């Protein structure tokens, strides 16, 4: 998202406004205003790793765009918007991840390599791989009898079509010491 | 649900894997090791698009 | 399948380590364990 000092009505703000955000959703319920629309209206831009060096990115829009003049103890310890010089804003930080990492529930509450591991195992998990599985003549195909979409899900799973073609079942897990088996 | 982006070769689904190369026409200065008759080197990987 | 069509290969200073610039371009968790660790990248 492009951030502009150019905002007559105050300070520096994200070109993309509530208008655009709704304008998109109308085209979403109609299933005119596409992704290219934000690109041609110059509200969003394509930054390579070299161009990335000359810009300043805010993580969150709202959480890194107002000012100041009680707090929830449960939430994680976060940083300020001390930057006047904001050029761009991250669409959503969770987009730093790839297909595999994106199926992990709360990866921000795990030890770094434990995520790396799961970003290998989910590929070795069974499930529906295509609905035409019955008309394909592949050597070896493993299909889960009764797939279940997970209870703990990402906002990102949507785009990945995971809850439509799942990897397993929501099993009733007891963390106990039983027979020592 | 099939996304495509691959080939069917002799009735086999083949995927072309992206290949990470160093960029070309790029000007790059590097320092040479302790036993070297050259202290520094400027390199350019000049190639036609 | 999705992750296979989004896979990157590095043939051949410290390439296995997750560089700062990989931010938002490559996944910081998706990589093979050992002998190709940090050479095989996932977008």
């Amino acid at each position: 998202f492009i951030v502009e000092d150019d905002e007559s009505l105050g300070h520096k703000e994200l070109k993309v406004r509530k208008g655009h955000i709704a304008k998109l959703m109308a085209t979403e319920y109609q299933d005119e205003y596409t992704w290219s629309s934000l690109l041609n209206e110059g509200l969003v831009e394509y930054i390579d790793a070299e161009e990335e060096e000359s810009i300043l990115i805010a993580m969150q829009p709202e959480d890194l765009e107002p000012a100041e003049a009680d707090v929830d103890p449960a939430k994680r310890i976060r940083v300020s918007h001390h930057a006047t010089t904001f050029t761009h804003c991250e669409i959503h930080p969770s987009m730093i991840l790839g297909v595999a990492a994106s199926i992990i529930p709360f990866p921000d509450h795990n030890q770094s390599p434990r995520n790396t591991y799961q970003s290998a195992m989910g590929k070795q998990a069974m499930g529906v791989f295509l609905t035409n599985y019955n008309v394909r003549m592949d050597t070896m195909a493993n299909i889960l009898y009764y797939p279940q979409k997970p209870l703990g899900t990402t906002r990102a799973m949507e785009y990945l079509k995971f809850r439509e073609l799942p990897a397993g079942q929501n099993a009733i897990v007891a963390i106990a010491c039983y027979s020592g088996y | 649900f099939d996304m495509g982006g691959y080939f069917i070769i002799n009735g086999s689904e083949k995927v072309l894997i992206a290949q990470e190369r160093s960029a070309g026409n790029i000007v790059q200065v590097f320092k040479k090791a302790a036993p070297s008759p050259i202290s520094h080197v400027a390199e350019i990987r000049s190639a036609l698009e | 399948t999705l992750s296979h069509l989004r896979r990157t290969n590095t043939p051949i200073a410290k390439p296995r380590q997750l560089h700062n610039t990989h931010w938002g371009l490559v996944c910081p968790a998706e990589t093979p364990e050992g002998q190709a660790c940090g050479l095989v990248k996932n977008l």
């Binding site: 703000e13 406004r17 509530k18 955000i21 979403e28 959480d63 949507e158 785009y159 | - | 999705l2």
Partner: peptide
């Protein structure tokens, strides 16, 4: 408002609109 600035949850409508138009094999095909 048509000019009110976007929220946190708002970003997901842009992301929705990204893949709606790009896909996931985007790069391979293009």
């Amino acid at each position: 408002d048509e000019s009110a600035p976007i929220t946190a949850e708002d970003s997901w409508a842009v992301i929705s609109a990204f893949f709606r138009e790009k896909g996931l094999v985007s790069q391979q095909l293009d």
